[PDB]
Design a protein around this ligand. Structure first.
Ligand SMILES: *[C@@]12=NC3=[C]C([C])=C([C])[C]=C3N([C][C]([O])[C]([O])[C]([O])[C]OP([O])([O])=O)C1=NC(=O)[N]C2=O
Length: 109
């Protein structure tokens, strides 16, 4: 299938730090687990990351709904790429949000 990357953020902590990233996520962005694990996914954003689309993620997280956005992310080396971002809330049986999963597709074409 199409190439994609996959990360998991812990929603129990207030700022959703990532706790697991697929091997491709490190290889696509250029960051390593020592620079990724325990940080919010915001370190990928830069000068051209549309602030309106970022708000959609922030809001859908606070409300606990899924959302899908198109952001401008930046590799470790500074070069940019276009990130199709889909976030999904994983709930416990008591309706509470426990984890947030992300699927990032480099859609620079
Ligand atoms: C990021 N992927 C990503 C994956 C998950 C599971 C979640 C919950 C969020 C992201 N983000 C967004 C980031 O963590 C944050 O929520 C946003 O910056 C909005 O909040 P702020 O505080 O900044 O207003 C992802 N952002 C990216 O840029 N790239 C991803 O791959």
């Amino acid at each position: 299938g199409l190439r994609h990357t996959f990360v998991v953020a812990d929603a129990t902590l207030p700022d959703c730090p990532l706790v697991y990233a697929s091997e491709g996520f490190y290889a696509m962005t250029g960051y390593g687990p020592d620079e990724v694990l325990g940080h919010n996914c915001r370190f990928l954003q830069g000068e051209g990351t549309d602030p309106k689309e970022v708000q959609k993620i922030r809001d859908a997280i606070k409300k606990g709904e899924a959302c899908s956005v198109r952001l401008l992310n930046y590799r470790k080396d500074g070069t940019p790429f276009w990130n199709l971002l889909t976030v999904t809330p994983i709930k416990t049986p008591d309706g509470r949000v426990s984890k947030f999963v992300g699927v990032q597709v480099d859609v620079t074409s």
